[PDB]
Amino acid sequence: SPEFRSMTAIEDILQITTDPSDTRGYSLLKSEEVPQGSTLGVDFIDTLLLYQLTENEKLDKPFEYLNDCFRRNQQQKRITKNKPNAESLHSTFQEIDRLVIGYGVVALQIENFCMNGAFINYITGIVSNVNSYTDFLSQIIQRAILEGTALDLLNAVFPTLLEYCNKHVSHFDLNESVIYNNVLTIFELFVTFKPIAEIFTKIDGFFADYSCKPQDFERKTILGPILSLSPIEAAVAIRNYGDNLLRSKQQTAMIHESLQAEHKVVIDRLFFIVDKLVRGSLNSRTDMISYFAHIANKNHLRRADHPPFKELSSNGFMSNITLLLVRFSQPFLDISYKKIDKIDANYFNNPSLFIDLSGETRLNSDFKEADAFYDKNRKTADSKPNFISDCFFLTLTYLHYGLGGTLSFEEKMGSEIKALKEEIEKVKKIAANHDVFARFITAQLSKMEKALKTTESLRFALQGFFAHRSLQLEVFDFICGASTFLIRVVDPEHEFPFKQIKLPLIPDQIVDNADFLRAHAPVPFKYYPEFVVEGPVNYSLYISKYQTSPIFRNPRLGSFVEFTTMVLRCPELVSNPHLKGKLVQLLSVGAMPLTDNSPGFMMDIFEHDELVNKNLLYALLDFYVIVEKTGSSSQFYDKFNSRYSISIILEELYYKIPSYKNQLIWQSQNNADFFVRFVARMLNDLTFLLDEGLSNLAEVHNIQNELDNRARGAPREEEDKELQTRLASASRQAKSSCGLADKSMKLFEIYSKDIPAAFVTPEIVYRLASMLNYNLESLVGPKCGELKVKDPQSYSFNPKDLLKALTTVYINLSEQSEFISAVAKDERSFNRNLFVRAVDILGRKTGLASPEFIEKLLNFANKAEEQRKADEEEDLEYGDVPDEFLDPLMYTIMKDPVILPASKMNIDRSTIKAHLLSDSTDPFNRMPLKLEDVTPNEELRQKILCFKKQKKEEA
Amino acid sequence: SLTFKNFKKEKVPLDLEPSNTILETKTKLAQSISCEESQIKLIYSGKVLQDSKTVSECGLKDGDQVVFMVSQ
Ligand SMILES: [K+]
């Protein structure tokens, strides 16, 4: 019959029979009389499937059975199509499709329906072979959507997938290749259904409970485990690198490459998934901001000096989220900037909705003013926020706490490894005679060895990730976009980059400015959190150390340098001087000539970017001075480190870019007061920097010799570790002082070459002679001569180059008679022989000094010695009144000497009286002065009298 | 009208108008035992039934068998 075929197609597809006790797997139908009737066909199908699923047996994998029934159904349709009477069996296949799907929904909607297994086992089977369940699942999803029960489906599937990831796999991470891939495939399959995407954030445990600890966000939250998939997970790093830590560079490189290829696919897939959520609905996209904001808010200690790692989210999780946020931000920050105005500059004019800003230092404002600003500024009920603006500032938040916590973790590892190697080495020396102690020592070695392996492996994995240019480019491009945005916030016109921004914002200030500057800081910029600037700069400095750095040759680099120069040009913008210290350090890395002698990678921008070339020179010379007032402060980003960094840029600008050379000469001729202020500072540091360098170098030797002792004093050995601290500390300070001294002296050389007259005005020329002669005395005498360290280059200590530069300065000023005279009159250091000794020392490094150079230095010294000889002849023959008895302006013997209160100069009462008659000032320093205020110098008056009496007795 | 079977067999005939909701059915089934309507699930012909739906909208006629489940 044809009533057969249907009956038997049903038998083969559900694998079931009734009388029937022969031939294939099929379960004999137990046991109800209502299904004992030996026909079968279309309307017995519900009954049959209800038997299978509720009545039991060991149908132990009910959901796996459904899928196979569904596969078998698809199979038979295809086979039936090409045979005589496909039509007649159509009603049969439909009913099977209908009900297998239907009950499939039911099985994945309520827990106790079948009496074998539960959600967890059905999901486990699905994860194991997702590609086999995919067509069926897709029908299941569609059926639940059509019957208006999609969320019931999701609340069985997704929380169950949470548990499967935490409890049924030992570690859900990149090592579990099949499993993590199949888990991603499940998310993608569901979330590609639009009606699913719109309610997904309403799944149970999509958000973190109130009591959920930060490390648990990635474990106890629907999206956590997949978001945590990353090569910078310890277990992944150990598997791929800790593997063979002694691998060649070539061999490590292939491992970086597989892990980068894989990590790229993961970010693509995480982004596809989250982008569906974000597009699903306003609810879904708002819930995502909310979800990422909560994670950021509870992870601020990720940037502490010693983070409590075990109480915080992981690097892998936080970096992945940072990259997704970067990726959501890209569109409104592409190079045309046409969407830039979508980001609200007044984002922080209202109290913050998602990001917790409590305790966040602002750019140039305190808690006080900012909270006041909220009050005045407000923004009404509901009113907020705008996804784009939420996303942009969340991205900055993660760059600092997410990525930023990841790079500092990696940065410290070199030192962690070295200390660890040393402790292991010490514990290896212990001779442990007692069995218990011997077990103890080996447990301690083995625990340190494990920590070492973990750290070395992670350093590799983190390096793999930061060398991943394709990923890091996205981060740096975000930074460049963010930079433009921030220049647009500062612009009074809010028009940049469509119109140039005019600097400075406030006229340049000709003793305690902080308050004034804060008061004229721009609004709303001064209230932005410091992290908006700290994030980019920590990232940029750090990522500079990588060959594959996203900064090198990036056409958007300009935007960041622009922002940097703005910030250095306008002290008002960012009050924190360690921040500016980092910024100038970044510019200096850009200025450093490359290994082949070509210009540094920022030189091109410094040259051609109008906003930069108009502002950088002034900015650098101004910052060089301002860092003095660094009240509380400490290295690195010290005033001396900053001056060193500035010197690198100054020197390269002057060598390679004529326009900056001209602006420098211009400042010296047409803005002398600003320029002399820079020079005086440079000059003043150069009075002590070599001393400070030598002194630190001798403290290194004191320390090193205290270590060597072995018979022991202790003459005090405080703590051995405090010595290593004190030894590293003296090494830093030695390098930093000698390094700067070298640079400053070189700046004196190259400038004095072109503008000798800037260096010979009254306020500089005597101080300069005094400083050059003193530094000359160290270099040619025992101060430098008795210094013997190993590798003095370790400490930027090149007494030969410094001597070379110093002597060139003498030469360069050798035709300025004020200088020849200042040098000849400096009784403290000047001595012709210093120049002879210099000539002899310079000739010890062949080629250091030309014969031409040597003759020039000697012509100079000769002129000086001859000026000194003439002076001493003039004084012996015509200097018959001691100098301190002579009026400073009239050159005659004083009758009634008085002291000026501002200058402290002695002057005759009649002279100052004749001065103040027409000009109400101290004639030496221009300070206001009234005649009443001069003070009688009786002691001096008595010397002059005694003196006039001594001479009276001959005449 | 309809018949409601347990897991372990056990039948409970309810007389329903093709108009009352499945919440009204449950409240009737719950009444017919010693439980709350909240503990009752209903499953008919390849789907879980819904509190809002009328017995009519479900495609239930008289003679029909629907699974019920009681809960915690
Ligand atoms: K432009």
Side-chain angles (χ1 to χ4, degrees):
Chain A
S1 74
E3 196 23 33
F4 264 100
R5 289 165 231 183
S6 177
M7 139 148 58
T8 109
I10 300 173
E11 287 178 336
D12 300 328
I13 290 170
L14 311 174
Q15 303 197 320
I16 193 149
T17 320
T18 302
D19 277 70
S21 304
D22 10 32
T23 307
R24 208 46 38 193
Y26 311 18
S27 53
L28 334 98
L29 198 153
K30 276 285 189 182
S31 52
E32 225 274 61
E33 279 170 326
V34 137
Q36 271 175 3
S38 282
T39 346
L40 264 200
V42 164
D43 49 27
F44 283 70
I45 292 166
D46 201 39
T47 328
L48 309 186
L49 286 166
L50 285 164
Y51 169 77
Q52 293 301 241
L53 293 162
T54 60
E55 233 84 355
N56 286 332
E57 67 224 77
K58 255 156 316 304
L59 221 171
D60 72 307
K61 280 148 170 162
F63 185 81
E64 182 187 75
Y65 161 74
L66 296 183
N67 184 68
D68 293 331
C69 285
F70 180 84
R71 244 105 114 306
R72 276 191 299 275
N73 199 54
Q74 307 318 299
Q75 187 49 208
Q76 282 254 138
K77 289 189 194 163
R78 183 181 318 174
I79 257 76
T80 292
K81 169 182 150 189
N82 277 44
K83 287 223 84 212
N85 204 346
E87 205 214 345
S88 79
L89 265 55
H90 185 250
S91 184
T92 308
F93 310 123
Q94 293 287 94
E95 191 59 359
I96 290 156
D97 269 345
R98 185 209 163 206
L99 295 174
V100 171
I101 294 158
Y103 283 122
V105 176
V106 187
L108 294 192
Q109 288 201 146
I110 200 49
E111 192 99 59
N112 264 69
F113 187 64
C114 318
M115 226 50 86
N116 293 314
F119 294 152
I120 186 61
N121 320 279
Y122 314 152
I123 269 73
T124 293
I126 296 178
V127 188
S128 306
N129 223 310
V130 78
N131 278 2
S132 280
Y133 280 92
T134 217
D135 296 346
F136 188 42
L137 274 176
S138 157
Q139 291 305 302
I140 284 171
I141 295 153
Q142 177 148 50
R143 169 74 57 86
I145 282 160
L146 296 166
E147 305 169 307
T149 185
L151 184 64
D152 291 332
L153 181 51
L154 297 172
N155 269 323
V157 170
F158 289 88
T160 290
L161 208 46
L162 209 44
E163 202 210 337
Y164 171 80
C165 298
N166 300 301
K167 296 298 297 231
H168 288 237
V169 208
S170 304
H171 305 84
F172 188 79
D173 64 28
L174 231 57
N175 294 334
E176 299 281 5
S177 179
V178 174
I179 285 157
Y180 95 72
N181 278 279
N182 290 359
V183 171
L184 293 164
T185 294
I186 296 176
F187 277 86
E188 287 167 349
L189 178 72
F190 271 86
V191 107
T192 304
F193 288 91
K194 175 75 192 266
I196 293 296
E198 64 177 15
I199 63 169
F200 198 92
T201 60
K202 299 310 161 188
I203 294 165
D204 306 336
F206 182 95
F207 302 101
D209 289 320
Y210 176 57
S211 72
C212 185
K213 306 194 210 187
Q215 341 65 96
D216 291 324
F217 298 154
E218 62 201 277
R219 309 172 55 253
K220 290 168 132 75
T221 252
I222 292 299
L223 290 174
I226 66 170
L227 283 170
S228 73
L229 265 16
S230 151
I232 62 165
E233 171 73 53
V236 174
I238 299 180
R239 171 79 55 81
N240 282 280
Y241 304 100
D243 209 8
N244 171 4
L245 292 160
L246 307 183
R247 267 185 185 117
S248 72
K249 301 273 193 213
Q250 185 170 358
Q251 278 166 341
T252 294
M254 269 358 98
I255 294 153
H256 294 333
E257 290 178 61
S258 345
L259 289 177
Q260 301 160 1
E262 190 168 4
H263 195 195
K264 277 188 175 76
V265 171
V266 169
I267 301 288
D268 289 351
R269 297 180 84 175
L270 288 175
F271 182 77
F272 175 91
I273 289 166
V274 175
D275 175 62
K276 251 78 225 222
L277 305 194
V278 163
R279 292 176 185 276
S281 74
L282 172 66
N283 281 1
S284 263
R285 105 186 40 105
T286 313
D287 283 347
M288 293 296 319
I289 297 310
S290 201
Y291 177 83
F292 291 152
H294 177 69
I295 289 150
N297 292 346
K298 302 296 154 192
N299 264 286
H300 299 177
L301 298 159
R302 279 182 57 84
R303 283 291 313 174
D305 288 353
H306 319 274
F309 305 111
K310 286 170 179 170
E311 308 175 56
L312 290 173
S313 292
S314 80
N315 295 334
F317 189 66
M318 300 294 282
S319 298
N320 275 352
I321 298 163
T322 313
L323 298 175
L324 301 175
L325 287 172
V326 164
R327 225 169 255 198
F328 286 111
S329 290
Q330 274 161 17
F332 43 83
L333 259 22
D334 61 289
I335 58 163
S336 82
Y337 292 113
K338 292 199 205 70
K339 302 176 203 194
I340 201 172
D341 43 74
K342 299 268 202 75
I343 305 161
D344 180 4
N346 294 322
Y347 185 71
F348 304 111
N349 290 196
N350 63 303
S352 203
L353 296 190
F354 300 89
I355 312 170
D356 196 338
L357 288 191
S358 93
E360 293 283 357
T361 313
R362 320 299 200 85
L363 284 169
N364 202 2
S365 193
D366 56 35
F367 303 140
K368 254 189 194 177
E369 305 201 333
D371 289 310
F373 191 68
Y374 287 150
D375 286 33
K376 173 192 166 72
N377 261 34
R378 212 220 320 96
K379 208 180 271 169
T380 33
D382 307 295
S383 195
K384 320 85 160 284
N386 177 55
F387 179 82
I388 290 145
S389 292
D390 275 325
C391 185
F392 175 79
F393 290 102
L394 219 30
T395 310
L396 285 154
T397 309
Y398 277 83
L399 172 60
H400 180 60
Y401 298 110
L403 282 190
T406 302
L407 58 91
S408 69
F409 188 70
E410 188 281 332
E411 207 160 38
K412 284 137 170 206
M413 291 181 159
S415 301
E416 290 170 11
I417 286 161
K418 176 188 182 77
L420 216 31
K421 292 189 150 142
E422 286 164 14
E423 248 322 285
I424 285 167
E425 179 160 313
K426 164 155 55 183
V427 178
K428 265 144 94 149
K429 304 174 208 279
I430 286 158
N433 287 20
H434 190 283
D435 185 81
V436 175
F437 190 40
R439 279 153 26 218
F440 172 66
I441 293 301
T442 272
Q444 175 148 301
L445 286 162
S446 108
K447 169 197 143 178
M448 288 181 284
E449 268 152 349
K450 203 180 134 159
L452 178 68
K453 178 177 192 187
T454 292
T455 300
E456 290 191 270
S457 290
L458 274 171
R459 184 177 50 167
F460 279 122
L462 293 150
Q463 279 176 0
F465 169 64
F466 293 114
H468 191 169
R469 195 171 206 256
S470 156
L471 253 30
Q472 304 304 326
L473 258 197
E474 306 185 51
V475 169
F476 194 66
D477 285 2
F478 174 80
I479 289 169
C480 295
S483 293
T484 305
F485 173 74
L486 291 175
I487 290 154
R488 200 184 176 81
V489 174
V490 170
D491 191 350
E493 306 299 328
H494 303 296
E495 198 79 78
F496 187 92
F498 296 94
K499 295 200 208 211
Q500 191 48 103
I501 181 183
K502 299 310 152 193
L503 310 172
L505 303 163
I506 57 184
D508 295 308
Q509 279 298 280
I510 303 153
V511 252
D512 258 345
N513 260 202
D515 273 18
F516 174 97
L517 282 182
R518 192 164 269 197
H520 293 74
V523 165
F525 189 82
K526 44 138 81 207
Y527 309 114
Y528 279 32
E530 251 180 29
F531 74 70
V532 317
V533 173
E534 201 194 344
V537 76
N538 287 344
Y539 176 87
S540 297
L541 267 171
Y542 167 86
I543 210 80
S544 282
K545 94 201 211 181
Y546 290 87
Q547 179 78 127
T548 56
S549 175
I551 303 196
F552 178 67
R553 75 203 187 266
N554 176 324
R556 308 184 62 160
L557 206 202
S559 304
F560 190 57
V561 180
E562 263 157 27
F563 173 82
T564 301
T565 309
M566 177 182 72
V567 161
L568 297 172
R569 178 65 179 87
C570 302
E572 11 152 343
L573 301 179
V574 171
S575 65
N576 176 345
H578 308 324
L579 221 29
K580 290 195 265 217
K582 295 179 170 166
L583 286 161
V584 96
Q585 180 172 307
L586 191 59
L587 294 194
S588 83
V589 169
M592 288 167 203
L594 305 160
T595 333
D596 60 309
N597 306 162
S598 36
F601 63 91
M602 290 176 182
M603 297 296 279
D604 211 72
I605 291 168
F606 295 160
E607 178 157 13
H608 291 111
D609 180 302
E610 284 169 278
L611 179 62
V612 179
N613 60 36
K614 276 184 169 87
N615 287 296
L616 176 72
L617 190 66
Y618 193 99
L620 294 166
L621 299 181
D622 188 42
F623 191 60
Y624 196 103
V625 173
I626 288 172
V627 275
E628 198 62 26
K629 81 156 281 171
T630 190
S632 78
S633 269
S634 279
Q635 59 262 231
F636 333 109
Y637 325 109
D638 223 23
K639 70 200 187 209
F640 295 113
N641 297 325
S642 290
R643 290 187 173 137
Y644 182 72
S645 295
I646 291 167
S647 296
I648 294 174
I649 307 156
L650 285 183
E651 175 185 29
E652 290 300 313
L653 295 175
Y654 207 85
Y655 292 154
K656 303 181 158 55
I657 311 176
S659 65
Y660 285 94
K661 178 159 171 164
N662 302 332
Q663 288 175 329
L664 181 153
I665 294 178
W666 195 90
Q667 293 293 161
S668 67
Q669 285 174 171
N670 301 121
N671 193 197
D673 292 339
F674 172 78
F675 181 75
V676 144
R677 203 191 68 190
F678 159 72
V679 166
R681 255 265 80 85
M682 203 172 50
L683 189 165
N684 268 325
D685 292 353
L686 223 14
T687 70
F688 60 86
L689 283 162
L690 191 50
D691 278 353
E692 191 65 14
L694 297 167
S695 178
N696 281 282
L697 282 165
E699 177 57 18
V700 167
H701 261 83
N702 287 331
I703 290 183
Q704 269 293 357
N705 262 114
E706 180 65 287
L707 262 100
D708 304 13
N709 85 67
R710 217 102 321 175
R712 225 207 294 100
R716 191 182 77 277
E717 196 147 27
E718 325 97 346
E719 169 74 16
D720 203 307
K721 79 165 276 195
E722 213 229 317
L723 284 161
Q724 282 184 243
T725 307
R726 233 148 175 161
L727 181 125
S729 190
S731 302
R732 241 166 16 240
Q733 196 56 72
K735 163 185 265 194
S736 174
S737 302
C738 291
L740 186 52
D742 254 288
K743 298 311 193 164
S744 304
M745 192 67 72
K746 188 77 182 178
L747 296 178
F748 273 113
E749 166 194 331
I750 71 178
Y751 294 160
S752 64
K753 186 43 178 172
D754 299 324
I755 42 165
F759 291 98
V760 305
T761 57
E763 74 174 280
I764 298 289
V765 68
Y766 309 99
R767 297 292 319 281
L768 189 62
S770 174
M771 182 274 287
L772 294 171
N773 296 358
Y774 184 68
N775 267 281
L776 185 62
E777 266 186 46
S778 305
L779 291 160
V780 308
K783 294 165 63 178
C784 286
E786 288 173 351
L787 191 64
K788 204 63 198 157
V789 278
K790 273 40 82 212
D791 192 30
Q793 308 299 313
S794 299
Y795 315 112
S796 298
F797 180 62
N798 323 266
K800 285 219 168 61
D801 286 344
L802 185 61
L803 176 62
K804 176 54 171 187
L806 166 64
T807 50
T808 308
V809 175
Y810 284 110
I811 287 164
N812 288 347
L813 305 177
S814 66
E815 280 147 337
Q816 309 300 320
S817 61
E818 304 89 353
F819 179 80
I820 290 162
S821 147
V823 164
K825 277 168 185 72
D826 193 60
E827 72 287 77
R828 218 174 46 92
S829 302
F830 182 76
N831 164 32
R832 187 179 175 269
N833 196 243
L834 301 182
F835 292 85
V836 173
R837 283 183 71 79
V839 153
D840 168 273
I841 286 154
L842 288 170
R844 285 187 196 141
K845 213 43 64 204
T846 78
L848 221 205
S850 176
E852 289 78 12
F853 183 96
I854 280 170
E855 141 176 81
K856 267 179 165 147
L857 189 55
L858 285 185
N859 174 79
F860 168 75
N862 285 343
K863 285 194 296 197
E865 164 75 1
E866 219 223 336
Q867 194 36 76
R868 167 211 166 280
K869 260 212 209 49
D871 290 344
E872 152 194 319
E873 186 153 336
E874 170 72 7
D875 157 80
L876 197 76
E877 210 57 68
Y878 299 95
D880 54 277
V881 284
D883 221 301
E884 42 162 328
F885 303 163
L886 296 176
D887 184 285
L889 303 172
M890 308 301 291
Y891 317 151
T892 53
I893 2 215
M894 293 187 275
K895 321 224 188 315
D896 184 7
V898 300
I899 308 174
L900 308 180
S903 60
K904 321 283 173 209
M905 288 279 293
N906 282 283
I907 188 167
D908 193 54
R909 160 166 267 112
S910 60
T911 318
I912 195 50
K913 180 191 258 131
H915 180 74
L916 295 172
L917 183 51
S918 72
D919 186 345
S920 286
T921 56
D922 188 297
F924 308 99
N925 64 13
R926 310 284 310 166
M927 290 281 302
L929 177 64
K930 296 191 134 208
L931 190 59
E932 308 90 80
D933 303 325
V934 302
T935 300
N937 201 337
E938 189 60 355
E939 197 227 353
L940 195 47
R941 192 177 79 78
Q942 288 297 128
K943 305 188 190 204
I944 290 156
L945 279 159
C946 177
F947 177 84
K948 280 179 167 157
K949 194 201 170 190
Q950 286 276 109
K951 300 290 112 103
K952 205 175 220 279
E953 280 138 4
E954 317 312 328
Chain B
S1 276
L2 319 181
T3 330
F4 296 85
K5 292 227 296 161
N6 202 278
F7 273 143
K8 87 289 257 64
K9 326 289 189 151
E10 191 166 305
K11 308 210 293 275
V12 196
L14 290 173
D15 194 24
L16 293 153
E17 71 218 355
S19 184
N20 31 213
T21 61
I22 275 144
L23 177 56
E24 283 163 20
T25 302
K26 287 177 181 185
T27 319
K28 286 169 77 65
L29 223 208
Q31 193 90 9
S32 175
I33 310 149
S34 177
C35 75
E36 300 296 348
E37 53 251 50
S38 77
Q39 302 174 301
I40 293 161
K41 285 88 175 81
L42 295 183
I43 298 91
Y44 183 52
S45 198
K47 78 212 199 284
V48 178
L49 298 179
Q50 273 179 288
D51 287 8
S52 305
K53 312 285 272 191
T54 69
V55 36
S56 170
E57 290 167 332
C58 288
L60 284 154
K61 36 144 166 33
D62 40 355
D64 288 3
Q65 35 87 130
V66 28
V67 186
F68 73 95
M69 292 171 61
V70 295
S71 272
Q72 198 70 74

